[PDB]
Design a protein around this nucleic acid. Structure first.
Length: 61
RNA sequence: UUAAGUGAAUAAGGGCGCACGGUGGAUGCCUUGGCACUAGGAGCCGAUGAAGGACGGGACUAACACCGAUAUGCUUUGGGG
């Protein structure tokens, strides 16, 4: 879904990176204490972070 | 009845033949891996950090294969359904 990450600016990029890293922290705390019905969301967040970082590399030459 | 004479059978265990089992992995058939070559490519990598490794990445992950904090994967151009 890079078609939306290419509809933004390099400031909102770093903003959503902050948000997703925080989401990963909270997911990682759910999985340990006996919660988190939907365990497939940990991979999804990793991959959205990967996408933002590649797209930011591409545009700054 | 008494004398003189002749005397089988009976296996604690063993042998030979036969019948059925147990152990053990020979023989037959088979291939997932090898051996000797032919024709074609290629004949170097490295301070822009190598060859080879250590430690990590999975919902559960001891091991092997893959990958490197963007970690069981990210973008892009083509194929395929």
């Amino acid at each position: 879904k890079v078609k939306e990450i290419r509809e933004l600016t390099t400031a909102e990029m770093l903003d959503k990176e902050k948000q997703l890293k925080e989401e990963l922290f909270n997911l990682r705390f759910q999985l340990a204490t006996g919660q988190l019905e939907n365990t497939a969301r940990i991979k999804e967040v990793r991959q959205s972070i990967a996408r933002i970082k590649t797209v930011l590399r591409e545009q700054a030459n």
